[PDB]
């Protein structure tokens, strides 16, 4: 199920689902990053693994992220998709981000890749805590850099797009069902008293 990477303002509607990449003039540049926080207001709240697992409070398993490239057929390029365990702060350059679990992907005939986020933890479970920097709640950082450039001819459009998916593996597990933090309004709705003659 796809996810809102481009959740910045002045992005109206369903343009919040894709991210724009383009050609550039420097050697290595950052593209995006995803905060892996299901409990907080992040890109992962509105997915299938997000909405179902907020009813529970303990979780344990692996995840996977799948990226589909929606450029033209004449467009080439490479990317690198790395994951860093939660010990420190977010990586800034490619020199401190190659040291995590990464994949290097070439834009080929078939247009998807898969980055497995392995279950690295001390305990058996983790909690959906309100503190982001807790030791049993902080997961890590997923971030993407440019390996080589994004190169197009004169006739293709310069701006290509990426769509980001997320699901769980076959060892995912959940525990201790609770109430969902999503629905929080108390607004009284029309035709409620119509059943009460």
């Amino acid at each position: 199920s796809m996810m809102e990477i481009n959740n910045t303002e002045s992005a109206v509607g369903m343009e919040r689902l894709k991210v724009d990449i383009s050609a550039l003039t420097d050697v290595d540049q950052l593209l995006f990053n995803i905060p892996l926080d299901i409990q907080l207001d992040g890109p992962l709240r509105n997915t299938l693994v997000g909405n179902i697992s907020r009813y529970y409070t303990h979780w344990s398993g692996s995840l996977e992220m799948t990226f589909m490239f929606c450029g033209s057929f004449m467009a080439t390029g490479k990317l690198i998709l790395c994951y860093t365990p939660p010990g420190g702060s977010c990586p800034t350059t490619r020199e401190t981000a190659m040291l995590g679990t990464h994949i290097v992907w070439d834009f080929g005939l078939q247009s998807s890749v898969t980055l497995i986020i392995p279950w690295i933890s001390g305990s058996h479970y983790r909690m959906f805590n309100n503190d982001a920097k807790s030791t049993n709640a902080n997961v890590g950082y997923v971030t993407c850099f440019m390996q080589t450039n994004l190169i197009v001819p004169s006739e293709s459009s310069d701006t290509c797009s990426l769509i980001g998916f997320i699901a769980a593996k076959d060892d995912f597990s959940l525990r201790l069902m609770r109430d969902s933090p999503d629905i929080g309004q108390l607004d009284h709705l029309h035709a409620a008293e119509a059943a009460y003659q």
Partner: protein
């Protein structure tokens, strides 16, 4: 294929790979399929025996809880209680049923009542709940003759006692309840959208038996429902925008970035934050 899963799966030891012609990590999501990259084929793993049970995420554990369906307070000095049965009145039970399309269960209904005479104490009182099906005549007064019916299912209980509990079987004329219905109700050209007549249960009438005395009352009734023996088909995405009414599925959206119309997830400063 079909198999019995009791606990979560395990991981087997991985070696180094430099194989040509074989790519585990590439796939194509244009086929509509989902990825099948085992972690054994992406990184180097160890062997881990896994004891985590998956018995809490069952459908019969996710659904079968006691949720409130009705709450209405009537003064006793229209002197009674009448409610055409729906499950769209309270928004926290509703959103958990909106995940599926068809359902087949047996409910288990608990009527809980409390009173507040407006001598501030109170003597004993006696209630009566009667289940009127569709078609049958509903009363319109406390002492109507429709309360003497031996055919309608009734139950008497007191305030001082534990609350009343019954159970009600699967009542539909089809083989499942339709949570959603993309059709009309009548054969005429202009009917009511979104409702089926195959799911209409009837009324539930509650009165108090004691004659009005010197002192007026205030009776508050709560009704709970717990499903049992649940079968569920066709999962659906969850509702995000808040509800607006009961007879349909309109949407309005909040004004500011969380759960607004043009933004479900609240904003961030930049993409490279």
């Amino acid at each position: 294929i079909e198999s019995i899963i009791k606990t979560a799966t395990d991981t087997v030891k991985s070696e180094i790979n430099a194989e040509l012609g074989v790519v585990p990590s590439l796939n194509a999501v244009e086929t509509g399929a989902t990825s099948n990259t085992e972690p054994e084929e992406a990184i180097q793993t160890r062997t881990v025996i896994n004891q985590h049970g998956v018995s809490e995420t069952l459908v019969e554990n996710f659904l079968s809880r006691a949720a409130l369906v009705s709450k209405r307070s009537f003064e006793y000095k229209k002197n009674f209680f009448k409610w055409t049965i729906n499950t769209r009145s309270f928004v926290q039970l509703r959103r958990k049923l909106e995940l599926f399309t068809y359902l087949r269960f047996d409910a288990e209904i608990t009527i809980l009542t409390t009173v507040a005479v407006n001598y501030v104490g109170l003597p004993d009182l006696t209630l009566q709940a009667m289940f009127v099906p569709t078609g049958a005549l509903t009363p319109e007064k406390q002492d109507s003759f429709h309360w003497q019916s031996g055919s309608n299912a009734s139950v008497f209980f007191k305030i001082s006692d534990p609350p009343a509990r019954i159970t009600i079987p699967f009542m539909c004329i089809n083989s499942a309840y339709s949570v959603f219905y993309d059709g009309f109700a009548g054969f005429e050209k202009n009917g009511l959208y979104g409702i089926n007549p195959a799911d209409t249960i009837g009324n539930l009438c509650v009165r108090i038996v004691n004659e009005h005395q010197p002192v007026g009352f205030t009776v508050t009734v709560r009704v709970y429902m717990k499903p049992k023996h649940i079968k569920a088909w066709a999962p659906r995405p969850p509702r995000t925008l808040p509800y607006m009414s009961i007879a349909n599925a309109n949407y309005k959206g909040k004004e500011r970035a969380p759960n607004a119309l043009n933004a479900i997830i609240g904003n961030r400063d930049s993409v490279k934050t």
